Amino acid sequence: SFVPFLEPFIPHENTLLPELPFVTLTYAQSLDSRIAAKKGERTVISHQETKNMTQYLRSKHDAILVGVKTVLADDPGLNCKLGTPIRPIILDPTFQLLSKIASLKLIKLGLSGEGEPPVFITRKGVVSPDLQANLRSDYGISIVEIADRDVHRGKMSWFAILKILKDAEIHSVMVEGGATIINDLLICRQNSVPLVASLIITVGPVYLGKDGVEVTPARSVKLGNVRWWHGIQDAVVAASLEL
Amino acid sequence: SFVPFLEPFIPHENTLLPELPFVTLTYAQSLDSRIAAKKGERTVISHQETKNMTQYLRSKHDAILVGVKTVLADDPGLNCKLGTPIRPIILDPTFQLLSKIASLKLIKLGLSGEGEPPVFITRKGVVSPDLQANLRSDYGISIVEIADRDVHRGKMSWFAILKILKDAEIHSVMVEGGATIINDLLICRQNSVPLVASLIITVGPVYLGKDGVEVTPARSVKLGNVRWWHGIQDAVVAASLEL
Numbered sequence: 421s422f423v424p425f426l427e428p429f430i431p432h433e434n435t436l437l438p439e440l441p442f443v444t445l446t447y448a449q450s451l452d453s454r455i456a457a458k459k460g461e462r463t464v465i466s467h468q469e470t471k472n473m474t475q476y477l478r479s480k481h482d483a484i485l486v487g488v489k490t491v492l493a494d495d496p497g498l499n500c501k502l503g504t505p506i507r508p509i510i511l512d513p514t515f516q517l518l519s520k521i522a523s524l525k526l527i528k529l530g531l532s533g534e535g536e537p538p539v540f541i542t543r544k545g546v547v548s549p550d551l552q553a554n555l556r557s558d559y560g561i562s563i564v565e566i567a568d569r570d571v572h573r574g575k576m577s578w579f580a581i582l583k584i585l586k587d588a589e590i591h592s593v594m595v596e597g598g599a600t601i602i603n604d605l606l607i608c609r610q611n612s613v614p615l616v617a618s619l620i621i622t623v624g625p626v627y628l629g630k631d632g633v634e635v636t637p638a639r640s641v642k643l644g645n646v647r648w649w650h651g652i653q654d655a656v657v658a659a660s661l662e663l
Numbered sequence: 664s665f666v667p668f669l670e671p672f673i674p675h676e677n678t679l680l681p682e683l684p685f686v687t688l689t690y691a692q693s694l695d696s697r698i699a700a701k702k703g704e705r706t707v708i709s710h711q712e713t714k715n716m717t718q719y720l721r722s723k724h725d726a727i728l729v730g731v732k733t734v735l736a737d738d739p740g741l742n743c744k745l746g747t748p749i750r751p752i753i754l755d756p757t758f759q760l761l762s763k764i765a766s767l768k769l770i771k772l773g774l775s776g777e778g779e780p781p782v783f784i785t786r787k788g789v790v791s792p793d794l795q796a797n798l799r800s801d802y803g804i805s806i807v808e809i810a811d812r813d814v815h816r817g818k819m820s821w822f823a824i825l826k827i828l829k830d831a832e833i834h835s836v837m838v839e840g841g842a843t844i845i846n847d848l849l850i851c852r853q854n855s856v857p858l859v860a861s862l863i864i865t866v867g868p869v870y871l872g873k874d875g876v877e878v879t880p881a882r883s884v885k886l887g888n889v890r891w892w893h894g895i896q897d898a899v900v901a902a903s904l905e906l
């Protein structure tokens with residue numbers, strides 16, 4: 421089963437970057453490395469056993485992180501079907517989702533207790549102190565700010581994002597997407613050391629085509645400690661990123 | 664390992680288009696669905712375990728087909744290391760390979776007996792009959808022409824290409840690339856019936872990045888009879904295309 425397969429890759433202590441959480445980067449792709457169908461089309465990539473595997477992986481992480489455009493497109497719950505607590509983290513630099521905050525599934529789950537209180541990562545000063553206090557009371561959310569010196573030409577440093585999560589006592593985070601975040605984290609290094617600890621990819625037996633949402637890093641990326649698993653329809657590769 | 668895995672997918676008589684050969688479309692891709700590294704970078708995708716699989720597949724086919732730009736990039740031999748004969752077919756609409764004919768590995772193997780006499784598929788009128796006779800004597804090659812009626816927008820009809828191969832007693836052909844040929848054949852249909860009978864893909868645990876040679880069809884493509892194999896480093900999926 422996928423349980424012994426994943427055992428070397430689930431979060432642990434042997435980390436080269438103690439200031440950061442253990443980071444798992446994990447997603448499901450078509451054969452042509454798309455992670456969503458073309459606009460207006462339905463996305464079917466991962467089948468039931470690897471969906472079970474993804475929920476199992478969530479049961480091993482303190483937090484789950486996705487980008488604002490994933491929330492807008494998918495309205496994900498960001499909890500764990502096994503029932504273990506996982507903290508939802510949404511990267512939303514200008515807090516686009518504020519105008520939608522009352523209707524999001526992840527907000528409803530936080531209020532009902534079926535999920536944990538969400539955290540939104542924004543630029544400094546997007547939400548005033550007073551408004552942060554009201555949003556915490558009314559919608560059960562917290563705001564974490566990235567310092568101006570950690571944003572260059574509009575892009576937040578992943579080192580800075582992960583350090584702030586670790587300081588919020590998040591010891592492990594499962595980063596699921598979307599493609600912008602995946603492409604960036606595949607190449608992110610701190611003195612040649614990757615910020616991602618484990619890469620876990622489900623490959624579904626489908627082509628989504630040239631107009632789907634593409635994953636491909638800006639340069640070639642080598643993998644180490646590679647192990648494969650497969651079920652009936654899907655395969656899974658797990659690896660580290662090479663130095 | 665891979666021999667019982669591939670048994671349902673090696674050429675067989677259960678075909679819906681008896682006018683055509685059994686077509687296997689098969690290639691090796693990176694995780695981001697690239698089949699060659701960016702210009703000037705070394706391409707390392709398939710490891711020896713699946714190289715052996717590709718050679719096994721060649722031993723089960725009458726012919727092997729690649730495009731002219733694959734020949735220019737890779738100088739492939741296009742024979743079978745297991746010693747069985749296989750007929751090389753090169754899609755070269757303008758017979759650009761005349762410019763390098765005496766130096767091609769595939770020409771050398773044909774003259775040495777280690778490979779079979781190659782066939783180049785061109786547009787009509789590209790190689791004069793007098794020249795065809797002299798190149799048959801000098802380099803042991805044949806030219807096959809696609810009629811003008813079977814060329815649309817500059818693109819040769821795959822049904823027309825495959826019919827001519829079938830009429831030359833090629834009962835099975837292994838199409839290995841490159842990306843243009845793969846992308847086109849993934850979507851090619853004759854009255855809802857795919858021309859490709861077996862799809863066999865090696866997935867290597869590497870990213871080649873945004874500037875590599877990409878495979879992605881023009882629209883989504885659904886797969887059936889899916890099965891997976893994996894080794895130390897690579898995975899392989901075998902499938903048929905749905906109607």
Ligand SMILES: NC(=O)c1ccc[n+]([C@@H]2O[C@H](COP(=O)([O-])OP(=O)(O)OC[C@H]3O[C@@H](n4cnc5c(N)ncnc54)[C@H](OP(=O)(O)O)[C@@H]3O)[C@@H](O)[C@H]2O)c1
Binds near residue numbers: 456486512601633
């Ligand atoms: N198949 C899978 O496993 C999977 C998993 C997750 C998501 N998806 C799909 O992915 C698609 C969304 O992908 P996407 O690329 O459009 O969106 P995304 O990666 O989820 O979010 C991108 C946004 O997040 C912000 N962002 C990300 N990194 C940042 C950084 N370092 N610094 C500052 N801002 C940053 C930017 O927001 P601003 O634009 O406001 O600056 C950026 O436009 C959806 O269709 C979803 O269904 C698939």
Ligand SMILES: NC(=O)c1ccc[n+]([C@@H]2O[C@H](COP(=O)([O-])OP(=O)(O)OC[C@H]3O[C@@H](n4cnc5c(N)ncnc54)[C@H](OP(=O)(O)O)[C@@H]3O)[C@@H](O)[C@H]2O)c1
Binds near residue numbers: 708817818819847
């Ligand atoms: N990893 C693997 O398994 C694998 C396998 C094979 C190749 N490759 C790599 O793929 C790359 C080559 O890919 P590519 O797309 O550039 O070349 P390609 O597909 O091998 O050949 C393309 C050329 O063939 C012609 N062509 C193909 N289909 C045609 C059609 N229906 N009608 C008329 N002409 C047609 C066009 O030639 P004209 O320009 O003369 O009109 C076209 O430019 C190489 O880098 C190679 O190493 C990888």
